[PDB]
């Protein structure tokens, strides 16, 4: 029943900005290589 | 995206991929994100500690 909560946009803004930085791979906490790149993009 | 996956779960999977690079609540906190987000989604995604 948690298919689309109130949480969704809130989750998206925080998650999307975090993921998008990693998508550039310049994430201060996380440097991402090849396998991680494909994992992010293919799964979501 | 919205190809079979619901918006909420779509947000969750993006978190799960983040989880593979090792995102913990402290990392989310470093980005201004609440620790509760890692912990709660961690439970929902059924991720092993």
- Integer Cα distance of A42 and B48 in angstroms: 21
Q: Which of A14, A32, A44 sits opposite B13 (nearest CB)?
A: A44
- Integer Cα distance of B1 and B31 in angstroms: 23
Range of the domain at B12: 7-44
Q: Which of A15, A29, A36 sits opposite B14 (nearest CB)?
A: A15
Q: Is the CB of residue A7 less than 8 Å from the CB of residue A24? A: no
**Is B2 part of a structural domain of the chain?**
no
Place of tokens 């909420």: B8
Q: How many domains does chain B have?
A: 1
Experimental technique of record: NMR
DSSP A9-40: HHHHHHHHHHHHHHHHT--SS----HHHHHHH
Burial label, A41 (beta-carbon count in 10 A; 0-12, 13-18, 19+): exposed
Q: Which residues of B touch A2 (CB under 8 A)?
A: 8, 44
CB atoms within 10 A of CB B19: 18
What number of CA atoms fall less than 13 Å from residue B8's CA on the CB side? 11
Lookup: tokens for B35: 């620790």
């Amino acid at each position: 029943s948690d298919a689309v909560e109130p949480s969704v946009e809130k989750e998206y803004k925080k998650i999307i900005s975090f993921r998008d930085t990693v998508f550039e791979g310049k994430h201060q906490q996380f440097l991402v290589p090849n396998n991680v790149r494909l994992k992010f993009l293919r799964d979501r | 995206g919205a190809m079979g996956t619901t918006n909420q779960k779509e947000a969750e999977k993006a978190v799960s991929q983040l989880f593979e690079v090792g995102v913990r609540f402290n990392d989310f906190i470093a980005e201004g994100i609440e620790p509760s987000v890692v912990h709660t989604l961690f439970l929902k995604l059924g991720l092993d500690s």
